Nucleic acid binder design. Structure first.
Ligand code: FES
Ligand code: FES
Lengths: 159, 159
DNA sequence: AGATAATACTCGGATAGTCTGTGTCCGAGTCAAATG
DNA sequence: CATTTGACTCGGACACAGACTATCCGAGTATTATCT
């Protein structure tokens, strides 16, 4: 099972695409009724991964670092939910009475290999789609004036 | 992160191929030095999915009910860790001041879409592989006499 | 007008509460045997 | 050969943990209003 908060961060990435100004955490927190503190924690988890930049001062907030096309889903999932792979091999082939010697274990145990390859196919099929593809499909479906309209609501009265 | 106990159950899928007689959890527990109780819990979790049969009595144990070829890795992982998906959409687009109305909510959020497509590819890479590929690769690499040999060790003194 | 110091707003990590695993346990049920 | 015992099996119920969730107050900077 994976973290729920990832959606919170990802639904912030999508809205920030249409935001030309710096936006403070608390604003987004109210933008979808979430613990302002814990969204701010998620933003810290993104600032650590150098995905977003955190400007200080009166006109402070969070801003996208690189263009929307170059940010893949994989980068987000790896940054937030935890970079560690999902399945881990406890190496039980080297435990018990019939422990395979260190001479016949030149290859990885086919179970581990298959599961790893599956996880790789997961994260690859995830990485193929970017945030730009999503913003293009949302301005295709939910109208091209909705997302700029939200981007305009976020910047209402900064100082 | 995924449940550790998944590996414990999946390494047993191979041994049942070589077990002609009923084999109880405790024997497998020593077969890879693991919690006899906690492996047994995972075995019960798998028995509930109706993959293997658990027979009680003196010469009782766990046996494969249906052929090894029709049991994919997908069936095992979903049985043990839980069939519920890892990622969960709480529908945050209908909460807060800028809640997407219940009229623009005909289709599933494109984020869910991408995450689905990724997990689907994951589960597809799980379903493609069977137990026949596992027993074939272990008889290909660690010799075709290893699997019958361990299957025979399991049956050493079933009284 | 320009320099300066008060100011007000915002990141950042350090801090408690709660929730699904993780490990363990003993009882109900069952078959095989030992026995008259 | 029927029966009693016996001991061995799984099944679900019981504590412990690391981790996710939610939250606080301290560090840093552009606004800004004043003072010369
Ligand atoms: S030793 Fe862990 S997958 Fe085989
Ligand atoms: S509202 Fe949940 S994935 Fe977009």
């Amino acid at each position: 099972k994976l973290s729920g908060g990832v959606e919170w961060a990802l639904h912030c990435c999508v809205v920030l695409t249409a935001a030309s100004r710096p936006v403070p955490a608390a604003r987004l927190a109210e933008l979808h009724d979430v613990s302002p503190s814990y969204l701010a924690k998620q933003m810290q988890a993104l600032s650590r991964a150098g995905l977003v930049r955190s400007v200080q001062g009166k006109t402070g907030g969070y801003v996208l670092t690189r263009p929307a096309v170059e940010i893949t889903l994989l980068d987000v999932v790896q940054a937030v939910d935890g970079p560690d792979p999902a399945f881990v091999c406890t190496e039980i082939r080297q435990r018990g009475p019939l422990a395979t010697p260190p001479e016949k274990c030149t290859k990885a145990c086919p179970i581990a290999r298959a599961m790893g390859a599956a996880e790789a196919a997961w994260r690859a099929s995830l990485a193929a789609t970017t945030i730009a593809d999503l913003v293009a499909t949302v301005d295709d479906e939910s109208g091209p004036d909705a997302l700029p309209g939200v981007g305009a609501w976020l910047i209402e009265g900064l100082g």
